Structure 1
Amino acid sequence: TNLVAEPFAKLEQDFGGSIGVYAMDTGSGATVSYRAEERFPLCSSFKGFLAAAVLARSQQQAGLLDTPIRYGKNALVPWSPISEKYLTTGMTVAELSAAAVQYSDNAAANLLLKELGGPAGLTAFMRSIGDTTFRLDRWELELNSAIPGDARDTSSPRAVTESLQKLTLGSALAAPQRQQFVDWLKGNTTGNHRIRAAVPADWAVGDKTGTCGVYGTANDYAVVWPTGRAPIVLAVYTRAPNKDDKHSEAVIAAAARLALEGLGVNG
């Protein structure tokens, strides 16, 4: 862990807040860790784990992913860019899952949360894979409040990375479902200025972002496949003390670069 120190403190000071980073080289097991056991708000980043929980359930329900879900206008939530285009038709569970992952679609996320038994149901799924840190407590949009000191709707960078590894590379999902989760993450559209900006174009990568809109709070987690070596799993979370502090995508990209440098991954 931190065999090579990196200037995360200067980065977060220039940002005006706190940055939390965990990065794991799945080959050697080496890690980079900075504020990695502090809690940070998940914001929309819970939607990746939501999609994984849906995939886990689909292992016992063979028709789940292709089930058509019809919803009313009252299910739309601000920032539902995919589900608003299918209000009059409905969408399948798999489509809602992909929209939640790849566009952070809020109506899709709340519909899938209901399917799983709400925030406690998603939390139970995370417990079932050995994550004792993650907690979801509220729905969209209330879960974005990012109040300083509030543990609701938070996890730690370390637990996020550990759970992401289990789900994308480990045995927490069966192999077809594992690859589907990876493929949804690879198709994300919201993360081009975050971890992806630190990842060379010739490497494969999937990610899920989160942006709370207050308290300088935003994040990204990713699996990255550098060519010729084992994949890297990493999480970068930010927060800041004042409600009107702005988040920064550049700070997240910069922290990801430092993490890769700390791991000796040439990028």
Structure 2
Amino acid sequence: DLADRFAELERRYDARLGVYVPATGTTAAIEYRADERFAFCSTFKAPLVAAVLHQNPLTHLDKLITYTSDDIRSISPVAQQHVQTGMTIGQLCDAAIRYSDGTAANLLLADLGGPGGGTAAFTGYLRSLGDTVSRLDAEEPELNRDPPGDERDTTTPHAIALVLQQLVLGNALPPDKRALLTDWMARNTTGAKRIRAGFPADWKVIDKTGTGDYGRANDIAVVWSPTGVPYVVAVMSDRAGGGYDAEPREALLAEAATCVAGVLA
């Protein structure tokens, strides 16, 4: 009867909607296509920064990474302003989470090192979290482009929600690093019209968006009730039936979120 509304949202927006809200002490899990695969798009950038924070002392944030204009591919509002100066790892994190900067994501992946420009190590980091389903295989911007049915660069609402839960509410990171990740997510600039727009203002919402082709629009959020109770909300969506150029529907995610807000109220 919650599922009835999500599928009505799917019909409204001609979209495939994936939602996961992990169970807590007081609420049952919310699952709609919780285990179907959806493309990460930029949502991997949040666990990416967690991986970077994990592998390395806080001090590593100050390392200056220089890069060239040839490295700038995909939306990079911050990295485009810093080719000449370079960027520290730390700000690369900042840009990757708060602005969904793709160049910053690629540099952080390279900083993870290893085959596929870091994707195997980032996949590995998710595994160290118990997420065996998700995988990152390409860099920005290729990871937004895989056709439907392709398992590359996909997660599921279930897996990615649980990952975020460990990163923000659990002990994946020592409190020092958990605060930095949580702060960047909290000051994200890309999610205003998604999960943030679907919850009442007095719910705190930290989130990481993802947007890609085939109408891919994701949002991963930690939301706090007015009473301060946290819930992890994974909302993922695509419109593959509309082809590569199918437009993402931000309103779809805000609606799905309001529905989740209604069950969490």
Task: Give the C-alpha shift of residue 6 in structure 1.
Answer: 5.0
Aligned residues with identical type, % of pairs = 47
Asked whether the 8 Å contact 2:138–2:153 carries over to 1, the reply is yes
Structure-1 separation of matches of 2:85 and 2:249? 37
Query: Which position in structure 1 is the counterpart of 2:167?
Result: 167
Structure-2 separation of matches of 1:24 and 1:45? 17
Moved more, 107-116 or 234-243: 234-243
Q: Would you tell me which structure has more helix in proportion to its own residues?
A: 2
Relative distance call for 1:5 and 1:216 in structure 2 (3 A) is closer
SS at match of 1:7: helix
Asked whether the 8 Å contact 2:20–2:157 carries over to 1, the reply is yes
Task: Give the C-alpha shift of residue 259 in structure 1.
Answer: 1.4
Asked whether the 8 Å contact 1:6–1:262 carries over to 2, the reply is no
Asked whether the 8 Å contact 1:82–1:103 carries over to 2, the reply is yes
Partner AA of 2:186 in structure 1: K
User: Which residue of the other structure, out of 24, 30, 33, is the alignment partner of 2:31?
Assistant: 33
SS at match of 1:179: helix
Report 1 or 2 for greater relative contact order, CA contacts < 8 Å, sequence distance ≥ 6: 1
Structure-2 separation of matches of 1:27 and 1:166? 16
Task: Give the C-alpha shift of residue 175 in structure 1.
Answer: 0.9
Query: Which position in structure 1 is the counterpart of 2:49?
Result: 51
In the TM superposition, 1:188-227 aligns within 5 A as 188-212=188-212, 214-227=213-226
Query: Which position in structure 2 is the counterpart of 1:125?
Result: 125
Number of residue pairs matched by the alignment: 259
Task: Give the C-alpha shift of residue 35 in structure 1.
Answer: 0.6
Query: Which position in structure 2 is the counterpart of 1:253?
Result: 254
Partner AA of 1:209 in structure 2: T
Asked whether the 8 Å contact 2:37–2:154 carries over to 1, the reply is yes
User: Which residue of the other structure, out of 101, 106, 110, is the alignment partner of 1:105?
Assistant: 101
Query: Which position in structure 2 is the counterpart of 1:70?
Result: 66
SS at match of 1:47: helix
Task: Give the C-alpha shift of residue 229 in structure 1.
Answer: 4.3
Asked whether the 8 Å contact 2:64–2:86 carries over to 1, the reply is yes
Q: TM-score, normalised by structure 2?
A: 0.93
Is 1:144 aligned to 2:144, yes or no? yes
Q: TM-score, normalised by structure 1?
A: 0.93
Relative distance call for 1:258 and 1:64 in structure 2 (3 A) is same
Structure-2 separation of matches of 1:239 and 1:154? 12
Asked whether the 8 Å contact 1:22–1:158 carries over to 2, the reply is yes
Task: Give the C-alpha shift of residue 262 in structure 1.
Answer: 2.4
Structure-2 separation of matches of 1:26 and 1:178? 20
Task: Give the C-alpha shift of residue 227 in structure 1.
Answer: 2.0
Asked whether the 8 Å contact 2:3–2:32 carries over to 1, the reply is no
RMSD of the TM alignment (CA)? 1.5
Structure 1 alignment gaps of length 5 or more: none
Structure-2 separation of matches of 1:167 and 1:6? 31
Task: Give the C-alpha shift of residue 203 in structure 1.
Answer: 2.7
Task: Give the C-alpha shift of residue 199 in structure 1.
Answer: 2.0
